[PDB]
Design a protein around this nucleic acid. Structure first.
Ligand SMILES: Nc1ncnc2c1ncn2[C@@H]1O[C@H](CSCC[C@H](N)C(=O)O)[C@@H](O)[C@H]1O
Lengths: 20, 708, 12
DNA sequence: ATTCCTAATCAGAATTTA
DNA sequence: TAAATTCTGATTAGGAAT
């Protein structure tokens, strides 16, 4: 057999704190 | 018949130049590129739009081919960038909905920039997709969608769920569910800063004390004390009346039993508290004072037609009520009480059963009827979590089904200069003729006291960890309230004086006059009460609660566990030490209440907890009782006052509130943090004036936004 | 000529 | 990494008094 | 009554452990 299924596709962290 | 590439390999120089990441020293690198490929007896070319095979019993994908290449693994690959269906975006199941007859077109997709690499064997078939300019002529539109299988007029971006177009000035604002005016005030202050004179012309709220607060601070605002759905029915009936009317001394007449000569018409409404649906006018009777005015159904006024014509001709000139097109912006923060995780009685199976939750729909019904240029809608983060975000996605799906540009963001109040956390959801909408506004980046740091839901982490308005600049230090409680004089449990004075100068930068800002805030609600010259300490009054606890907080020690983190008779046990579960008999107050009721020991399996440190100067309040809420929350003042025997809470919410001190103390607490507890609204107001004004820049969803606020 | 006063009915 | 547990959510509702 | 008083759940991000 059958037509192979295609691939459909981490974000950078957001930093609210001072150090991390 | 196997899938293969058609034609000669793309000239090496041109192949490397166009797709440089495929050559040179885990992205799939190419040995050579092609212009065409044949799959199942069909020839496909670069740029073709195709259907692509997906998971079992899942809708086929839709993609625009951008590369035909053979990898360094001898395999045949193609690259497409994905088109999103409406249900492929964050809307998901809410593609089913309807807003004033508008539904999602099945032929309308959204071009993304998401790419993927797949083998040729995945391509199903070609599909003709056309690009419709949203600002085209409607006739030229129809002939273009007539030509197509699918079409797109906007792009979709996962970041902040953006739907967007491809590739002194005055403005009117309507505040639905206006409250005491936090959101509408901030918007116009931030607008004014960007150069746009945004004016809150209309406000609707069925709480009279909220309207009394907003009307006092905004005398020109036509604030209507009525439900939003009645406001909507009135708007429709107002258009019909306007259509009907637009461009010596009277002799006496006999009057029947209840017939009286009218002087003028001084009001108009649809239904209301004791009335049923239909237009009523507030009639002023000749020879009678305003106290004798009454509401009368329009059918009782057929014998005074000129008074109606005069009222409508006259009200249409000042736009006492907006016709479609009169409204440039619609903001609103509809009730969150049916949504918020505080409510242990929500029903996740019927998220629209609560009349509070239905006001979300009524908000978009009003958007649908007035078609403002910009829509700004606020609610709590649980709107993306409760019932799997049903009501959050309902709101976004309404905007895009109406062909609005839309964006979704989560903003943290403290990030703009408050000792709060208070993450809130903000939904931008903008007509295809306008620039979609951005979200403003945090100007301060915060103590993080909550996170975003995983399904919406990409809508958090914040700096990336890799690119965060040095921001202003986090504001703490002392920076907001150390200014203020001492008050007691019983404190009934609406208006008192400050017992000192402002000590901090935040306190100097929160004390600024109206002119300094760019608050033009009183026009030239200062308004009232600039210089007075307003509503610095706590919730007047009863004798039992008062003596209870009187016994809470003035320590950091002092709570009910510090009272005589309670000690801690294993796993931090509170108990009585039997050494002490249960203490009673002068009333004969227990010093510690039973619920305090029963609260969260006896593990909570909240009951009768005291705040401290180096702490933050995560959410200023509408209730001020110290039973299930930490709201006792650090040094004084009381809870935080209305004014202290309003400072944590970012209200300028001149913003006077009205009503009972409990109602004043509700007004500040429901508000949108005024600095948050002021920041969004700058992005709204920059976008409205066509002075924004670029496709980026995030905006660094200018240095001018944080004054001297 | 002079017109007639405009009236309404007062629901009580 | 895995489990476990805490903290966090612009309160509503029942019951009990005047 | 209507006002006051008494109570207190369902999730989930993220934090401690390991
Ligand atoms: N059905 C309804 N019709 C009209 N207003 C309603 C309503 N249900 C609730 N409200 C009002 O909607 C308001 C939401 S509080 C929002 C306040 C505002 N965003 C601010 O920042 O100040 C409440 O004040 C409540 O009185």
């Amino acid at each position: 057999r059958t037509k192979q299924t295609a691939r459909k596709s981490k974000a950078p962290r957001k930093q609210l704190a001072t150090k991390a | 018949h196997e899938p293969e590439f058609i034609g000669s390999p793309v000239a090496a120089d041109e192949a490397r130049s166009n797709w440089p990441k495929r050559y040179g020293r885990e992205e799939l690198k190419a040995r050579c590129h092609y212009r065409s490929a044949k799959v199942d007896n069909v020839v496909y070319c670069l740029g073709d739009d195709v259907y692509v095979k997906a998971g079992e019993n899942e809708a086929d994908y839709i993609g625009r081919i951008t590369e035909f290449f053979e990898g360094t693994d001898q395999c045949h690959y193609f690259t497409c960038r994905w088109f999103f269906r409406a249900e492929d975006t964050v809307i998901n199941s809410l593609v089913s909905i309807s807003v004033d007859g508008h539904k999602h077109d099945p032929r309308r997709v959204f071009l993304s920039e998401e790419k993927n690499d797949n083998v040729l064997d995945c391509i199903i078939s070609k599909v003709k997709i056309v690009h419709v300019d949203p600002n085209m002529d409607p006739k030229a539109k129809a002939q273009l969608i007539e030509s197509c299988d699918l079409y797109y007029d906007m792009s979709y971006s996962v970041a902040y769920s953006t739907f967007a177009n491809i590739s002194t000035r005055t403005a009117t604002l309507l505040d639905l569910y206006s409250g005491c005016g936090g959101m509408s005030t901030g918007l116009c202050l931030g607008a004014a800063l960007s150069g746009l004179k945004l004016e809150t012309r209309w406000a609707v709220d069925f709480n009279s004390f909220a309207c009394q607060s907003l009307k006092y601070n905004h005398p020109q605002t036509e604030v209507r004390n009525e439900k939003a759905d009645e406001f909507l029915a009135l708007l429709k009936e107002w258009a019909v009346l306007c259509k009907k009317y637009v461009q010596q001394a009277d002799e006496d007449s006999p009057l029947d039993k209840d017939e009286f000569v009218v002087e003028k018409l001084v009001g108009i409404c649809y239904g209301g508290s004791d009335r049923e649906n239909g237009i009523y006018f507030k009639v002023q009777w000749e020879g009678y004072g305003p106290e004798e005015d009454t509401w009368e159904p329009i059918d009782n006024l057929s014998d005074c037609p000129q008074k109606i014509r005069e009222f409508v001709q006259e009200g249409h000139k000042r736009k006492i009520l907006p016709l479609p097109g009169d409204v440039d912006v619609i903001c609103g923060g509809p009730p969150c009480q049916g949504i918020s995780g505080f409510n242990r009685y929500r029903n996740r199976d019927e998220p629209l059963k609560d009349e509070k939750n239905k006001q979300m729909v009524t908000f978009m019904d009003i958007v649908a009827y007035l078609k403002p240029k910009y829509v700004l809608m606020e609610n709590v983060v649980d709107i993306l979590k409760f019932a799997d975000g049903y009501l959050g996605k309902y709101a976004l799906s309404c905007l895009v089904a109406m062909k609005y540009q839309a964006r979704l963001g989560m903003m943290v109040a403290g990030c703009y200069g408050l000792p709060q956390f208070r993450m809130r959801v903000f939904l931008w909408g903008a007509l295809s003729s306008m620039v979609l506004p951005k979200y403003p980046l945090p100007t301060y740091d915060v103590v993080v006291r909550g996170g975003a839901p995983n399904a919406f982490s990409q809508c958090m308005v914040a700096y990336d960890e890799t690119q965060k600049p040095s921001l202003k230090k986090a504001l703490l409680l002392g920076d907001a309230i150390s200014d203020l004089p001492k008050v007691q449990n019983h404190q009934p004075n609406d208006v008192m004086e400050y017992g000192g100068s402002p000590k901090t930068e935040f306190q100097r800002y929160i004390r600024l006059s109206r002119k300094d805030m760019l608050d033009w609600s009183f026009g030239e010259g200062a308004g009232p009460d600039e210089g007075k300490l307003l509503d610095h009054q706590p919730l007047r606890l009863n004798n039992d609660d008062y003596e209870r907080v009187q016994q809470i020690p003035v320590k950091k983190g002092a709570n009910f566990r510090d009272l005589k008779g309670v000690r801690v046990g294993a796993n931090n579960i509170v108990e009585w030490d039997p050494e002490i008999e249960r203490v009673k107050l002068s009333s004969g009721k227990p010093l510690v209440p039973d619920y305090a020991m029963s609260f969260i399996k006896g593990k909570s440190l909240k009951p009768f907890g005291r705040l401290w100067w180096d702490e933050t309040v995560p959410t200023v809420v509408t209730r001020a009782e110290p039973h299930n929350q930490v709201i006792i003042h650090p040094t004084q025997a009381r809870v935080l006052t209305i004014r202290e809470n309003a400072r944590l919410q970012g209200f300028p001190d001149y913003y006077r509130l009205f009503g009972p103390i409990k109602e004043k607490y509700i007004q500040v507890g429901n508000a949108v943090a005024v600095p948050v609204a002021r920041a969004l107001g700058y992005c709204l004004g920059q976008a409205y004036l066509g002075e924004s820049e670029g496709s980026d969803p995030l905006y660094q606020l200018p240095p001018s936004f944080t004054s001297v | 000529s002079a017109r007639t006063k405009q009236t309404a009915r007062k629901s009580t």
